[PDB]
Amino acid sequence: NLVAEPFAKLEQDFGGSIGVYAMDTGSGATVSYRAEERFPLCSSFKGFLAAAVLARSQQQAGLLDTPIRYGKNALVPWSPISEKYLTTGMTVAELSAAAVQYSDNAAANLLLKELGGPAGLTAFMRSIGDTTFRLDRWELELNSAIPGDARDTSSPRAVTESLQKLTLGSALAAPQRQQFVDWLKGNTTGNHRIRAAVPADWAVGDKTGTCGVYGTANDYAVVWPTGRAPIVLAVYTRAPNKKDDKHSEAVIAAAARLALEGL
Numbered sequence: 001n002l003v004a005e006p007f008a009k010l011e012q013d014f015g016g017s018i019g020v021y022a023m024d025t026g027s028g029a030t031v032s033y034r035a036e037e038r039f040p041l042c043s044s045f046k047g048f049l050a051a052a053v054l055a056r057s058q059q060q061a062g063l064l065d066t067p068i069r070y071g072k073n074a075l076v077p078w079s080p081i082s083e084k085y086l087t088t089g090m091t092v093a094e095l096s097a098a099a100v101q102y103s104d105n106a107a108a109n110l111l112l113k114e115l116g117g118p119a120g121l122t123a124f125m126r127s128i129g130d131t132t133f134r135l136d137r138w139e140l141e142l143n144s145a146i147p148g149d150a151r152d153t154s155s156p157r158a159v160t161e162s163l164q165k166l167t168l169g170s171a172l173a174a175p176q177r178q179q180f181v182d183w184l185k186g187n188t189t190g191n192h193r194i195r196a197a198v199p200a201d202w203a204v205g206d207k208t209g210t211c212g213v214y215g216t217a218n219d220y221a222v223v224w225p226t227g228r229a230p231i232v233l234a235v236y237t238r239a240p241n242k243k244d245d246k247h248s249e250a251v252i253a254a255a256a257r258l259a260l261e262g263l
């Protein structure tokens, strides 16, 4: 219908699959396209990982400033922050900021270990009412993005609903929610994705993912307009099925534009 056609055309031009869910928290209006289909999370799970850390900080005093000593064996490719602190270590909060804002892989594994692994993060997501999210593997294996594999996936609607609960709703206490918002607002990896769709004088917090298959990538965000209620949205892609020419970032930005225009 009228709502789906601009997304279907964008998806047809892209050649893969796109999933979009957006909610206007002022009016309750939504935009939905393949919003209940599963897509690989890849690095985007790191936002929810940081939220799970903050949930634990409601119960364990001093957790955030607790140093985690790690060695070279914890490092994996794309660990730009943790590679600089081998001899000094990093605190839980510093690891969380690195995982969110630089998508640091070693930091994400260290925090997963603190939380009881992929099963522990999945249990946290269940505890906030997310029945779709599943994390099954660690970095780097979780990025495999095998078509039809449900491991390490969620849906755009579940991502958006969980993000809303954690940044604007009641799933975290206010100081924790503000810290999550601040980490998302300072993300450095999303400048070509949802942020490319928003007016400059708005504000955005986001977390990206870029899977091991070109064309499978994603971004979710809270967007704060001027003078009206925030919008929460998620845009996920799956690569065309049966070398950097998939323009996945442009597709994510274009889908975000349609959502913000149509809302």
Ligand SMILES: *C(=O)N1C[C@H](NOS(=O)(=O)O)CC[C@H]1C(N)=O
Residues within 6 Å of the ligand: 042, 043, 044, 078, 102, 103, 104, 105, 140, 143, 189, 208, 209, 210, 211, 212
């Ligand atoms: C996350 O999906 N990853 C971490 C890193 N940065 O990508 S992101 O900025 O889009 O999050 C490299 C790609 C990927 C990975 N393979 O771990």
